Symmetry: C3
Subunit: 175 residues, 3 copies
Amino acid sequence: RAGPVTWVMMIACVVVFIAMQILGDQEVMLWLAWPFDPTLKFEFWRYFTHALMHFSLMHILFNLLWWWYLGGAVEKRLGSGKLIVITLISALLSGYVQQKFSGPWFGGLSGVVYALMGYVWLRGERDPQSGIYLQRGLIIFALIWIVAGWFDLMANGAHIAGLAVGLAMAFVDSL
Amino acid sequence: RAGPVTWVMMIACVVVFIAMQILGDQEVMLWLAWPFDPTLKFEFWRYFTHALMHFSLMHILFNLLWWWYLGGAVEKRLGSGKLIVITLISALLSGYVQQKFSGPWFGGLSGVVYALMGYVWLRGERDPQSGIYLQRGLIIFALIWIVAGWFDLMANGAHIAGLAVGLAMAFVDSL
Amino acid sequence: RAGPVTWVMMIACVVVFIAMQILGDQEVMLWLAWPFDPTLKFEFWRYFTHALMHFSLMHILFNLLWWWYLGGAVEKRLGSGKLIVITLISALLSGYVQQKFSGPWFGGLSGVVYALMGYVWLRGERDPQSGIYLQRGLIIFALIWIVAGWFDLMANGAHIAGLAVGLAMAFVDSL
Ligand SMILES: *P(=O)(OC(C)C)OC(C)C
Ligand SMILES: *P(=O)(OC(C)C)OC(C)C
Ligand SMILES: *P(=O)(OC(C)C)OC(C)C
């Protein structure tokens, strides 16, 4: 089954998505969004909580599906700590790039998912003996969620940041 | 493979969905919908057939996916009879609540699916030795179809009736 | 994993779908569409490349999902050559019927997918000893993608051509 990190992230996303339905999106953004005023700059959770918000059924479903499968595999094969670090770094960096191009009104797990996509693919190519890889079939469908992101079907710089982080980390780990 | 009950329900839903495309939704409602005039009150199938109608591709697909997996597991592990009773009771009760709040113009397998969700989850927690349970990952995605229902993303009373029936039955069976 | 034919078809579809996002649909049609002027009648790839174009995320995703599973199983169980021939014949014939009813502005893998659906189902019924079959559950969901096609939820003649080819071939192979 899904490890504690994979699992708790899913719970958090659902609860937050529930709170968004009840109180409204903007009400919830006010509390969880990347700091959107200087008075909010020391509320450190805001640098990470943006990733917990989803704006439609399909948004949370595809993010949670990918997180479940990829985050789930990383945690099981490489440990909770690894999942935690990949998650914290991609959220922060994709969040910062996103905000820089398009402002602080955004949310979603996809920066993290892209990181997990980049990481799991590069790690499987370069370090097969790790037991972790992205299957051919799934590479195709990962590329589709990825293309959905690049052509607004997020800021593509944030997209890139998500991916890059995953790649850079997979690269370091292969060494 | 899928048992006779799981299987026949899927066939029926598809055929009915096909008849809906050909003749139109309303034409089919006229025959399968919860009684919508006193002249129709003795046509007993109407208390159950409302559940066989779907109004979009995504409506039937998600209902049939969940029914396939959950109904399929109940039938295999606990027997066709159990599936039949859960199905008949949730359809009737969710149907009655639905109609009471929003009138007789409705359809879909989701009252039943919610029952199966409630039943399979509660049964797995309380009676593990039964071989039946809802995995962590799937709990998350069940909650999403459930939230899709509660926030009209059905009458939530009907929603509750569906769930309650599943829970009440799982509760009795754990004893 | 997915064989070379199953795999290369997916790559081609994604790359083409990418080129469609960048250059636009019509720009790409101009090069890959069924001949739409006599000057183009000797460009033989056009009789097959129409199948590589997809017009939405859901279009390519469902086609590629089905192709992945069904094409993947055919190639693994019966060989790359078989997949190649089914693919070439259904593309050509469904493409020709499509164009005859609705003109040369169309694209998609679904004519091929329907062929694979017809082929895998009929082959499993008639030649069980072949190791290839369409499971009950999946029959239901195949019928849904099929119904999505028939009721424009393609020209149904093309739909039929796709299916027929799959059936005719499964029929010949059962002998
Ligand atoms: P991601 O969760 O999803 C994109 C595919 C739109 O979005 C960014 C804002 C993290
Ligand atoms: P369900 O089939 O689906 C809901 C999620 C809308 O609907 C009721 C009417 C049974
Ligand atoms: P297919 O790829 O998809 C249909 C379900 C619309 O379409 C034809 C044009 C091949």
